Amino acid sequence: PTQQINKGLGASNIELGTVIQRVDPQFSWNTTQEKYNQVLLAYTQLSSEQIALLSLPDVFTQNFLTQTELSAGYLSASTTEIL
């Protein structure tokens, strides 16, 4: 769906964002943010569904741990030496 639209407008040599802004009743520069954000999201040329994968929170944590290893003495790397 996306791919098709993307390449079709490629052949059109113009962008979906372009079309959305032209189809806005008002002068786009005068329009609302809810247009601006939306249209840039259009200009992404991206699946939203991939974005779901991109944005759903983490399965893990920064570090899994256990009482066993903790009692055996956890260790973090020396880390202040980084910036």
Added chain:
Amino acid sequence: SNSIEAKLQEDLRDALVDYYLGQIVPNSKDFTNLRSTIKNVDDLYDHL
């Protein structure tokens, strides 16, 4: 040119391929025992 979309169908090939490897291989109630078939070309013979 139609050549523009003529890529999509290769993408569709890839899609099918993964649906085989990803879904069929673990979800094949057919062929559930038999494996091999590691490569696309294989079923072009085996059932296609």
